Amino acid sequence: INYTTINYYKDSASNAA
Amino acid sequence: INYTTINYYKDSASNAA
Amino acid sequence: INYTTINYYKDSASNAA
Amino acid sequence: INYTTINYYKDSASNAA
Amino acid sequence: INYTTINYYKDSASNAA
Amino acid sequence: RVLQLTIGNSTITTQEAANSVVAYGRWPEFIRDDEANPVDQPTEPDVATCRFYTLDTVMWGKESKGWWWKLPDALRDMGLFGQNMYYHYLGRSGYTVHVQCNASKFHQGALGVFAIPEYCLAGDSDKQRYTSYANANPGEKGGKFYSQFNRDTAVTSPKREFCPVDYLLGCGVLLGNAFVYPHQIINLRTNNSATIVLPYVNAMAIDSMVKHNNWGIAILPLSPLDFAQESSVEIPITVTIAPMCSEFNGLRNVTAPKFQ
Amino acid sequence: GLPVLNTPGSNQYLTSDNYQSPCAIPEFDVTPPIDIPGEVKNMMELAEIDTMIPLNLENTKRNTMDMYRVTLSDSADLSQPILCFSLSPASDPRLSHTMLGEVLNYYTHWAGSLKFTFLFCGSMMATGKILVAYAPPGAQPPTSRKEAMLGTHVIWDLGLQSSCTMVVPWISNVTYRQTTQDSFTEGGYISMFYQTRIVVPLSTPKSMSMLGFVSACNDFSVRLLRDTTHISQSA
Amino acid sequence: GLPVLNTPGSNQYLTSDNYQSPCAIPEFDVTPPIDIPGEVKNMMELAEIDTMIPLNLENT
Amino acid sequence: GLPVLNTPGSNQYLTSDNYQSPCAIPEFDVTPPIDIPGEVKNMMELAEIDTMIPLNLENT
Amino acid sequence: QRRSRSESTIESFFARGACVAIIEVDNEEPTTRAQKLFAMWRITYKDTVQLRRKLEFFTYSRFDMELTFVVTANFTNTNNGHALNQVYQIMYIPPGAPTPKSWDDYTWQTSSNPSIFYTYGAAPARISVPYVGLANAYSHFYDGFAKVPLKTDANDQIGDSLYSAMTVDDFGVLAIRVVNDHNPTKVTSKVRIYMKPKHVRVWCPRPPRAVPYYGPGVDYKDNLNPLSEKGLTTY
Amino acid sequence: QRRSRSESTIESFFARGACVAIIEVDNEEPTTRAQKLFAMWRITYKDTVQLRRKLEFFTYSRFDMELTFVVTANFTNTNNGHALNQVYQIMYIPPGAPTPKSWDDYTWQTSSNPSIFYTYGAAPARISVPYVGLANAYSHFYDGFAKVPLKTDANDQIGDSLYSAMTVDDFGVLAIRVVNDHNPTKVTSKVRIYMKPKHVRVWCPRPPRAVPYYGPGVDYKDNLNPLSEKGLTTY
Ligand SMILES: CCO/N=C\c1ccc(OCC[C@@H](C)CCn2ccn(-c3ccncc3)c2=O)cc1
Ligand SMILES: CCO/N=C\c1ccc(OCC[C@@H](C)CCn2ccn(-c3ccncc3)c2=O)cc1
């Protein structure tokens, strides 16, 4: 089972691993 | 009627039953 | 115009009318 | 560019313009 | 990788860059 | 060009025809609802009650300041339309106010014919909204205006009558803003007659007429009549009202209100 | 179940918003609407109504019946203006208490070509010609006929018809003008002059009268709704 | 992870609402319904019943 | 109706952000733009302009 | 044409919400003074002047309603003991429902009447009411009477009525009380109910009120000089 | 080329928002001192120096506006009684709207003027304003006058104007007051309005100001030595 991932910011470095 | 289920975390053990 | 309805819980009796 | 509109209530008069 | 963008308001000038 | 104005049985033609202004652009009609639950037919005296009722004649002078009527107050005394108003519970009606005022080519002065829906009026005393029923309805002779405001101070004998001011129009608005109502201006330079067609406007679909008044006809002298050299001069102003498409419902016993 | 974050701007009651809100009385049945005549769909069809302006504001007759009529006579001068007023539709006192003014009090910006109308309520036999003019701002105020006929003007007659119509155009440096007495964005000037003396035959009154109207054409628009000043409450 | 904003009207217990709420006793088994006679589906079938009015209200 | 959770970092006014915000004056009509000459699209076309330097800096 | 008229539509003309009332509430023992343990408010629009003159352009209208409650508090003594947070109960009451008569009656149990338990310190509460007019529109400026004194009445004090009043009790009341107990100190609190219309459709426009109001009616008593003084031929 | 120029675009050059003003507000009885029951602020950008010199690179510009309110408070006495939470009302006022004159006037009813009821202790409020320039751009550094003294004026004190001012009252005012009542203790509070531009498009660049400012104009009074001392042939 996978999960849902959305990078909510236009910045690249403000994501998570 | 079913409901909506999304595991919001990449961890497996942080879900619910 | 209808609206959006999602029963967010696996329990049945915790919904609304 | 349009936007996203969802009437979140089953009542009609509790919407916005 | 792109991200998710929704202008949540019917106003135009209340968006972001 | 000459208007052949015939509603019902009587007829007002003219030697010279001027205009006809319909209020709000909708001609009066019946109840047109194909999905209405009462499909049975009420009493519609549509060709048997449309006589041109003529009110009493007032003598317009130099220093006289205005006149005002209420509808359907101005028909309760006379006419068989008055009998179809006391007996029934409720109704609806469309009116043809036709104000004529003839004078020579040498007079002057400007009139103003108004039609205010839900025309309220101000009291006079410090007791707020304290007005008896006899003074609330002048009937067919109509009330007048006053130049300056002169309230009452006597606390023993209550007057309980209206006292409006002409350039405040009774409601509390300026005269120069009163032209957003449906209106018609009798300019004595060109024409002598005028007419206004009023449809039925109310919050309900149908209403009682004893305890309610839809339209109030206000006549304001925009410029006072001056003759060549004199200082006292009397020409008349005569107002004609006819119902159109009137209908009633709900018979009951006869109800006669008092008029002191 | 979802990683939310409080954005800056929470828990503030803004007086102008269109958020949702729960319904206090649910499952309710609305009374269906009927066809009431005179359905105003928009506020700009009130300034498009022929309305009277008050003109004469002397000490004797202000706030009286006769403050709406303007006396033009036979013994008047042929070289003096009859009536003059600057075209500030919400700050000048000869326009602020008109229906055209009483809508523009609720706004800051306005635009459009508003049209005037006058009505001569004199006798049938008396004639004459009246010249009404417009003067765009930036010049001296017009005083006499020699310096006023240069701008946009209408030679209005009295014999044939008895009603003028003056479509004052929209000549402005900015796109939207303001609704306050500000000298940078000024409307203009309006002046009326005797073209000829009022010819009046004998056995006819000498004091004729003239009313004054105002309107607005279909190119009329406002923005930036605000609250007004004409009402008061000392309590 | 999502730019939320508190709309005006939070943290108020309105007496007439249909929001969600967590279940105190999860995984529960409901006793199934049976056919009890006289099933009132709606309140307007009580005013449609022939009922007696009281009329005489003297002091005695 | 939805199991939210306050992530760490709520209720902070960061001086450099692009969140949403409600509009104070709704339904407003914007004056349309015109073709003003000299449209600087980017800051790096100001350092690309021939400019004079000062050189002599004696006490006098 | 490129002139967006949609800034001044009817939904945008009543989009800004204003204040309608101010209601006190106190918390002490019932003394020989005014017992302000709870305060009732007659629901009406004509208690301020920003909104009354803004609604009374129009004769007939129907529109849905949205309220907003704002709660502030104070103290009455300098070095007062630090009191806790409070819970205010705004309870709506329709006509026919029993009027509460003390601090803790059985009618405060909100058995069916919809109410809002409000917590001080949080966001302002924000509820919506649909259209509750019994006719097809609300009726601004009703004319006639409620009752007509007939000829064969008992006397004149029974058939008498009040001019221009459709209902004795217009649309119910509000009721505000503190849930917490009495204290030796007292905390004076004020409540400012706001009001924002939505979905507005009106009919039959009328000119706006200009002389100041005097009570709930349409009459007037004071300040009978609406216009100022300004010379005629002088700009 | 692999050199991302997009870090220094115009939307990113004005992306950081700064401070523009500091506004006081107090809560006590009106004494013989300065009555700080409410404070008005003239809306302008040229009240600080971080943002004035950052905007005045550019002659003409149009851009949308975003504000942010920050509220802090204090006390004035050592062992003060513990006062409650407060509600601050930031009320925007366009030009032409009536200026409030006391603590509780009828113009504070926000009849149509958009305002924000703010709760102390919560997040900073965060509102957005679209473009409200009446021309096609805002005008940094206007040159001419508002009025021109003509030859045939009355005197020289009427036709006089002020150098470089498009409007007497630029774009309205703010208004801040405490909703809560007066207290025997007083709570001095400061408000720091912030300001962040968005959607910026500018025209016609000009060199930046280097001698320090002196009032709202373009002039200068003091510190006329912008450069330091350094030997010519010496590194
Ligand atoms: C759940 C509890 O709390 N909520 C609130 C609630 C509040 C108000 C409600 O009713 C509404 C009111 C309103 C429509 C008012 C207005 N209105 C418009 C015109 N008039 C009126 C008419 C003639 N006389 C006086 C005023 C008048 O009363 C209903 C529910
Ligand atoms: C809902 C209530 O509260 N909200 C706020 C609100 C605030 C400010 C508003 O207007 C905006 C302002 C602004 C665009 C300012 C700026 N600006 C840019 C240049 N200038 C200016 C020009 C010439 N003189 C002085 C400065 C100038 O004033 C509108 C609404």
* I19 interfacial to chain E (CB closer than 8 Å): yes
Ligand nearest to the CA of K94: 2
What separation in Å is there between the alpha carbon of J92 and the centre of ligand 1?
A: 10
> Rounded to the nearest 5 degrees, what angle is found at the Cα of F257, between the Cα atoms of F252 and F260?
170
Q: Please answer whether residues G162 and F108 qualify as being in contact, where contact means their C-beta atoms are separated by less than 8 angstroms.
A: no
Question: K194: part of which helix (H) or strand (E)?
Answer: strand K189-205
In our burial notation (b when 16+ CB lie closer than 10 A, e otherwise), range F188-210 reads bbebbbbbbbbbbbbbbbbbebb
J115 C-beta closer than 6 A to ligand 1: yes
What six digits make up the tokens of I18?
A: 């692009």
**Extended strands (E) in chain H:** 3-4, 13-14
Query: What is the side-by-side order of every strand in the sheet holding G3-6?
Result: H3-4, G3-6, I5-6
* Residue J145: how many other CB atoms lie within 10 Å: 24
* J201 interfacial to chain F (CB closer than 8 Å): no
- Asked if D1 and E7 come within 8 Å (Cβ–Cβ), the reply is yes
CA distance F237 to F239: 7
What six digits make up the tokens of F34?
A: 């194909």
From residue F146, give the alpha-carbon distance in Å to each of B2, F175, H44: 76, 14, 57
What six digits make up the tokens of F12?
A: 């007002």
CA distance F156 to K41: 56
Q: What is the DSSP letter of H32?
A: P
Q: G90-96 contacts: CB < 8 A, separation 24 or more?
A: G90/G179, G90/G180, G90/K96, G91/G179, G91/G180, G91/G181, G91/K96, G92/G181, G93/G57, G93/J227, G93/J228, G93/J230, G94/G53, G94/G54, G94/G55, G94/G57, G94/J230, G95/G53, G95/G214, G96/G230
G24 C-beta closer than 6 A to ligand 1: yes
Place of tokens 């329709």: J94
**Extended strands (E) in K120-188:** 128-129, 138-139, 173-178
Q: What is the DSSP letter of F92?
A: E
Percent helix, strand and coil across chain E, each to the nearest 5: 0, 0, 100
H and I: number of Cβ contacts within 8 A: 8
Q: What is the DSSP letter of F56?
A: P
In our burial notation (b when 16+ CB lie closer than 10 A, e otherwise), range J67-76 reads bbbbbbbbbe
- The one-letter code for the residue type at G173 is N
CA distance G223 to G219: 14
Q: Which domains does chain J have, with CATH numbers?
A: 1-235 (2.60.120.20)
What separation in Å is there between the alpha carbon of K9 and the centre of ligand 1?
A: 53
Q: What is the CA radius of gyration of chain C?
A: 9
Q: What is the DSSP letter of K85?
A: -
> Rounded to the nearest 5 degrees, what angle is found at the Cα of F92, between the Cα atoms of F91 and F94?
150
F72 prior amide bond cis, ω within 30: yes
I24 C-beta closer than 6 A to ligand 2: yes
What six digits make up the tokens of J90?
A: 């705004």
Q: Please answer whether residues G14 and H8 qualify as being in contact, where contact means their C-beta atoms are separated by less than 8 angstroms.
A: yes
CA distance H23 to C13: 8
* B3 interfacial to chain G (CB closer than 8 Å): no
Contacts of I5 in chain C (CB under 8 A): none
* K31 CB-near residues (< 8 Å, 6+ apart): none
CA distance F190 to F173: 29
Q: What is the DSSP letter of F149?
A: -
HSE value, Cβ hemisphere, 13 Å, CA-based, for J60: 24
* F44 CB-near residues (< 8 Å, 6+ apart): F30, F245, F246, F247
> Rounded to the nearest 5 degrees, what angle is found at the Cα of K19, between the Cα atoms of K13 and K21?
145
What separation in Å is there between the alpha carbon of J127 and the centre of ligand 1?
A: 13
Compute, in degrees rounded to 10, the torsion defined by CA atoms G31, G35, G37, G39: 70
Helix (H, G, I), strand (E, B) or coil at F255: coil
Residue of F89, F131, F166 best to disrupt the J interface, most CBs of J under 10 A? F131
- Chain E: residue nearest K131 by CA? E13
- Asked if D14 and J15 come within 8 Å (Cβ–Cβ), the reply is no
Ligand nearest to the CA of K68: 2
Q: Please answer whether residues F133 and F210 qualify as being in contact, where contact means their C-beta atoms are separated by less than 8 angstroms.
A: no
Q: Please answer whether residues F188 and G121 qualify as being in contact, where contact means their C-beta atoms are separated by less than 8 angstroms.
A: yes
- Asked if A10 and E1 come within 8 Å (Cβ–Cβ), the reply is no
K114 C-beta closer than 6 A to ligand 2: yes
What six digits make up the tokens of F209?
A: 């007429």
Ligand nearest to the CA of K63: 2
CA distance H27 to C12: 9
- Asked if E9 and D3 come within 8 Å (Cβ–Cβ), the reply is yes
The experimental technique behind this entry is: cryo-EM
Chains F and H touch (3+ CB pairs under 8 A): no
What separation in Å is there between the alpha carbon of K64 and the centre of ligand 2?
A: 10
Chains K and G touch (3+ CB pairs under 8 A): yes
Q: What is the DSSP letter of K5?
A: G
- Chain E: residue nearest K63 by CA? E13
Question: J13: part of which helix (H) or strand (E)?
Answer: helix J10-13
The ligand 1 atom at the shortest distance from the C-alpha of residue H16 is 1
J45 C-beta closer than 6 A to ligand 1: yes
Helix (H, G, I), strand (E, B) or coil at J106: helix
* Residue numbers of A between 1 and 17 with CB closer than 8 Å to E: 6-10, 12
From residue G212, give the alpha-carbon distance in Å to each of F29, G71, G98: 36, 12, 11
Q: How far is B3 from chain C (nearest CA, A)?
A: 5
Contacts of I26 in chain E (CB under 8 A): 10-11
Q: Please answer whether residues J94 and J36 qualify as being in contact, where contact means their C-beta atoms are separated by less than 8 angstroms.
A: no
What separation in Å is there between the alpha carbon of K45 and the centre of ligand 2?
A: 8
CA distance J14 to K112: 8
* J22 interfacial to chain G (CB closer than 8 Å): no
- This PDB structure is determined at a resolution in Å of 4.1
CA distance C3 to F84: 51
Q: What is the DSSP letter of F207?
A: B
Compute, in degrees rounded to 10, the torsion defined by CA atoms J127, J133, J137, J141: -100
Helix (H, G, I), strand (E, B) or coil at J8: helix
Helix (H, G, I), strand (E, B) or coil at J6: helix
CA H22 to chain centroid, in Å, comes to 19
Q: What is the DSSP letter of J209?
A: P
What separation in Å is there between the alpha carbon of J48 and the centre of ligand 1?
A: 15
CA distance F154 to F144: 22
The parent domain of residue G159 ranges over 1-235
Count of domains forming chain G: 1
What six digits make up the tokens of G198?
A: 């009022």
Compute φ and ψ for J100, nearest 5 degrees: -65, 150
- The one-letter code for the residue type at G28 is F
Ligand nearest to the CA of J52: 1
- The one-letter code for the residue type at J166 is M
Choose the residue to mutate in K23, K51, K65, K69 for probing ligand 2, maximizing ligand atoms within 8 Å of C-beta.
Answer: K65
Q: In 3D, which of A3, J122, G9, G18 has the Cα closest to residue H4?
A: G9
CA distance G53 to F109: 18
The ligand 2 atom at the shortest distance from the C-alpha of residue I25 is 1
CA distance G212 to G87: 14
Question: G191: part of which helix (H) or strand (E)?
Answer: strand G189-194
**Extended strands (E) in G18-113:** 51-52, 70-72, 83-86, 107-111
Pairing status of strand K189-205 against strand K23-25:
antiparallel
What separation in Å is there between the alpha carbon of G234 and the centre of ligand 1?
A: 26
Helix (H, G, I), strand (E, B) or coil at F176: helix
Q: In 3D, which of F182, F180, F125 has the Cα closest to residue F153?
A: F125
Choose the residue to mutate in J23, J41, J42, J44 for probing ligand 1, maximizing ligand atoms within 8 Å of C-beta.
Answer: J44
Q: How far is H32 from chain G (nearest CA, A)?
A: 28
Q: Which domains does chain F have, with CATH numbers?
A: 1-260 (2.60.120.20)
CATH number at residue G234: 2.60.120.20
- Helix extents (H) in chain J: 10-13, 52-55
What six digits make up the tokens of G87?
A: 């075209």
From residue J208, give the alpha-carbon distance in Å to each of F144, F185, J142: 23, 22, 16
Contacts of B1 in chain C (CB under 8 A): 7, 12
Pairing status of strand J138-139 against strand J173-178:
unpaired
